[PDB]
Amino acid sequence: GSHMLRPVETPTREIKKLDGLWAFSLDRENCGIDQRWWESALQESRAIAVPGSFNDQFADADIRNYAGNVWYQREVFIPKGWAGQRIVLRFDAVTHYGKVWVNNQEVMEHQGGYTPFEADVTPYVIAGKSVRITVCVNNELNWQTIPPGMVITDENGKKKQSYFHDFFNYAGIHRSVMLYTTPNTWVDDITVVTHVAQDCNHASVDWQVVANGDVSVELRDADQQVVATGQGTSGTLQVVNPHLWQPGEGYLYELCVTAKSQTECDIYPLRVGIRSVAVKGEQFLINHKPFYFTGFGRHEDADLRGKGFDNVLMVHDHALMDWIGANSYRTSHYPYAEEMLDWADEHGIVVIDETAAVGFNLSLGIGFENKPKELYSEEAVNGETQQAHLQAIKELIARDKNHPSVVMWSIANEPDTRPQGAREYFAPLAEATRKLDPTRPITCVNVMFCDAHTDTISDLFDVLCLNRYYGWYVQSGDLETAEKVLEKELLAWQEKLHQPIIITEYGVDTLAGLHSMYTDMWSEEYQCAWLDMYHRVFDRVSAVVGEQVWNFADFATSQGILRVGGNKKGIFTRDRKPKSAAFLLQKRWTGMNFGEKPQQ
Amino acid sequence: GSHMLRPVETPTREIKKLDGLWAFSLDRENCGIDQRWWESALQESRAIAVPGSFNDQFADADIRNYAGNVWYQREVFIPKGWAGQRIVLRFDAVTHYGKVWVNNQEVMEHQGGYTPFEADVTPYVIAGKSVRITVCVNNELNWQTIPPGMVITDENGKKKQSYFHDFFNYAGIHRSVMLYTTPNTWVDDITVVTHVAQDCNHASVDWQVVANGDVSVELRDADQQVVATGQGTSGTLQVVNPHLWQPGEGYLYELCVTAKSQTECDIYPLRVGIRSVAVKGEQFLINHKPFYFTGFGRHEDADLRGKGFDNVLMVHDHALMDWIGANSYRTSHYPYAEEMLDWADEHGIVVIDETAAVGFNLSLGIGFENKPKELYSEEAVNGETQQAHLQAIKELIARDKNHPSVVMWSIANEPDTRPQGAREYFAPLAEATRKLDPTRPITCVNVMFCDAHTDTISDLFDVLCLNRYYGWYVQSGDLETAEKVLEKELLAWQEKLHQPIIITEYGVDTLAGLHSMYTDMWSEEYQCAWLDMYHRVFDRVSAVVGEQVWNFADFATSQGILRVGGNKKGIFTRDRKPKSAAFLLQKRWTGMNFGEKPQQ
Ligand SMILES: CCC[C@@H]1NC[C@@H](O)[C@H](O)[C@H]1C(=O)O
Numbered sequence A, B: 001g002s003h004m005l006r007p008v009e010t011p012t013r014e015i016k017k018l019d020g021l022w023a024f025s026l027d028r029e030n031c032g033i034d035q036r037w038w039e040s041a042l043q044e045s046r047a048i049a050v051p052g053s054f055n056d057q058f059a060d061a062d063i064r065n066y067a068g069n070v071w072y073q074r075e076v077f078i079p080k081g082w083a084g085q086r087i088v089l090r091f092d093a094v095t096h097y098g099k100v101w102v103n104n105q106e107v108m109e110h111q112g113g114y115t116p117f118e119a120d121v122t123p124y125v126i127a128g129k130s131v132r133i134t135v136c137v138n139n140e141l142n143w144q145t146i147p148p149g150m151v152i153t154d155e156n157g158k159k160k161q162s163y164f165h166d167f168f169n170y171a172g173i174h175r176s177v178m179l180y181t182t183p184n185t186w187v188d189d190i191t192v193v194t195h196v197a198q199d200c201n202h203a204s205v206d207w208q209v210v211a212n213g214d215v216s217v218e219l220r221d222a223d224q225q226v227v228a229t230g231q232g233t234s235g236t237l238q239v240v241n242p243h244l245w246q247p248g249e250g251y252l253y254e255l256c257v258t259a260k261s262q263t264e265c266d267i268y269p270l271r272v273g274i275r276s277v278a279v280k281g282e283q284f285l286i287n288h289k290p291f292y293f294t295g296f297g298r299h300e301d302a303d304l305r306g307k308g309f310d311n312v313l314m315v316h317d318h319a320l321m322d323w324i325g326a327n328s329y330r331t332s333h334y335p336y337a338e339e340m341l342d343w344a345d346e347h348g349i350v351v352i353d354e355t356a357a358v359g360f361n362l363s364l365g366i367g368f369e370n371k372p373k374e375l376y377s378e379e380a381v382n383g384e385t386q387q388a389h390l391q392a393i394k395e396l397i398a399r400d401k402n403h404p405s406v407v408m409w410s411i412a413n414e415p416d417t418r419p420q421g422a423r424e425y426f427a428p429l430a431e432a433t434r435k436l437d438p439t440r441p442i443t444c445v446n447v448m449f450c451d452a453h454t455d456t457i458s459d460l461f462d463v464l465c466l467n468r469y470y471g472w473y474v475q476s477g478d479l480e481t482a483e484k485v486l487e488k489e490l491l492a493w494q495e496k497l498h499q500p501i502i503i504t505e506y507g508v509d510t511l512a513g514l515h516s517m518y519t520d521m522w523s524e525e526y527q528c529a530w531l532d533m534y535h536r537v538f539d540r541v542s543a544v545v546g547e548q549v550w551n552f553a554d555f556a557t558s559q560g561i562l563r564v565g566g567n568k569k570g571i572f573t574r575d576r577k578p579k580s581a582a583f584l585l586q587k588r589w590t591g592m593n594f595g596e597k598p599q600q
């Protein structure tokens, strides 16, 4: 993807613009573009908080289920001590589609809902005066979006969005908005890659695009003592005798790249961890040692902000995952806030990084009521779709490439691989991803009903990721049949592919408070029994190297007869209170040795 | 007390009269006695179920909180094949006060709310025709009732009942109503007492009042094979080599007493278990072996019947107590339905039998609002009161004397022994109880605030029963101070009295579903932590021989700022669903060896 690094603070800086309170108005009949609302202060507005989804801030179902365009707006005074500097305006996430006006000049456009976008806007502002930022946000999904969907227009012209993923289609500006200043010598991009041999010593090859001038680099210590130095726009190899990034700890050196121009200097510190991931046979190695993933599929979801990033929420949810014994998690169903990958970096949390490609499946929704008949087809998942997907992988890898916590990419989640053309679609995406980053493995999370004798595309990926729900959606309520089905299906996957197997979803809906002596579905007792049987089967299969229970907390979804106020598969309630199973896992995950598979 | 045995089925029988549907009407202005409503069919009635409390059958607060007289009524056809037989009409429990008319002849009167009452009514009916039963039920409590209370009349003359016990003052006909026929030779009463030496052999002395004729007895086997025979109105000793009644099993011989008159025979089978209870030093022996009580303080309380006896409820609640590992319980705060003591008899459940003497304490209610200033005084707990109490002990012992499950009598629960005259009151009651039955020990359950340096009456009883709530009502939320206070108070009791100590109440209010990471009051996590600390302290004190957590299920109480829909101290919800702590106890109570104290 296009060059981009996280704005970090050096002797050149940034001014936060998530002042929260912006002017918001929905655009019910698309009068916005016609009257180019970007030209004058928004007519009939109400205060909105940024970052946060717009759906639940007003406790009104008619905004919540709204489909179309919405408008955010805010004036800003640009500090004047920035004259003779390049001013860039970065949105870290505007969910689905966004385009923005610096009063009357349009600067940016973007269709990715969970990855940042910026543009050099130094020629459209001059320091000292205040300019109006106007943003147009679209929350519509068609077949060429990631994720896909179908907007449908009723007799009256009202839009209603249909999609094929579980979680609710929150929208708005979900993450940081930000003006930042950099010297006129550009450090546009950095790439770092790490190698190790027997933990004693090795090196970090390096590449850098620095648009405007000479580059020297110094890798410094936690003590910020210089441990090696390089020179050059690329190469930039140095060798060490380091303390290398390990799951329990997360030791981070600091790559200080300097960009000397003939008059201007530019300094960027990029945190690096010396880790080497690979897979060998049925083992997922990290610094040449097998690893056992424990933890969760998560979500960006809280009670009144939707998917809006929040620092308290990050701190408290890491406190819970740490207590519970989790050592890993995967950014379930879209790229997460980079704050979380920095956190995982500093604390040694291992992360499976996933794109927003969910809902490439029309076999999962179940009920009594027009979806296309060919998944892979011109009307549905098409060629435009494949390039949109490849673009989504491009942005995610472009943004999380140097993070030590990122240990694996996941292209998509639960696609249907039964129809022909599934492999036609996914093969070039797997190959392209492999060339965009050869450092980490490639996975594609596998859906329950593309079983081992049925799935078409798992050949193309390095590590097998399974979402299994025997005993819940099938064999409902019967632990003795679910155990057999699960164990032969696991052994089957192993015989078929001899890969490491990570169970990336396994869970059951559990109403907090619903208790039962009969250990039936929806009780806390059932959650415990079910997870516990699954754990015996994992412990009895050689190739399973990971367990991430399906959902850390309950989250919101679309309305339906299967979702009681949302998906209740969480170990914790949406307000982070523990169900009984929370103590089951805490007993397992801190009982085992760190990163080691329980020996049965 | 007056002679009475359970109606059991021989070649002379009984016809059940809990036909449920009776005519019920409340008597709002005491017009009942004046118009002697007993004379004609009840004016303006509604159907009521018998047995069951009248409070919650109609989902109406104005009947629920009603104080005064209520009227039940029902016609009955007396079977004619009963001519020349004695017909007796027995109410097994009419709660608080009851008096009854066989159409126009009044036959019975009773003030005990949980013990049966009958009367020979052979001269007031003749077999073949149908007579109307009319019952007047009073639910008022004054200072000479067991339990006591204060009715208070507002400006308008409406009664409202005030009391000083936790549970709600349910009323009505709570248990079996019953017409039964016996031959004109009376077996009015039987008493059986058991002795053992070294489990090899001994005897059961015996006494019998059989009003009308010669008596022979045969003690028969579970096989009903004759193992010994006696002759005489008393003495009736025989010696055995028996399999003796043990907690885990409950072996019951059958004492078949026959009453030969010159023309009529009468046969009564009375189930007996060969058990010997006593206390020695700090040990509670049963068949000369120390015992550890586990289990609950219970209640007669369910969701729509109030305190009405129900067979399903008995079967299901015994299934839960059996699963959970309980081996004992105590009939908390009133005599229970004899069905439950028969059950405990057959299954080997050990029972601490208690009278209805609760609320002899004006220091327990807490709030912001006229109770007497002297507990023991002429206006309050008086001499009439003491004779009423002695009468209550008389009836309970008279009815549960031959039950092997009954292992101890408890005169009262949580009286205040601080004021002078507490010992003046309770001493003659303790001595009288000891002469009414020397077979089993005597206890008086001790309230939290009459601590070891304060209590006045514990000298007078055999086994010390403690209700302790450190960490809940005092030291609220602090497990580390509650542990110290509890441990020194337990050791203090032991130094002071060198008796066996049974913790007969210990528990915390727990909202099912309320979970917390901070282990604070009202969460399930707090229930578990609290009970668990209490268990460490029990395990570290020599003299503690028993643990009965406070309440098996949540139950209803009077309204107040301290009771959220009732007392929430149950391990189970009112509809019998388990809280998290239910599995804590199940792990302890079935982990230990049966009847043995955990060795720490
Ligand atoms: C069989 C499909 C299961 C499905 N897997 C994807 C998750 O995004 C959903 O939350 C989960 C669920 O339905 O609970």
Ligand SMILES: CCC[C@@H]1NC[C@@H](O)[C@H](O)[C@H]1C(=O)O
Pocket: B165, B166, B167, B333, B364, B414, B448, B467, B469, B473, B505, B567, B569
């Ligand atoms: C400190 C008195 C505690 C009291 N003990 C008697 C029981 O009948 C109550 O239910 C119990 C409670 O308050 O929970």
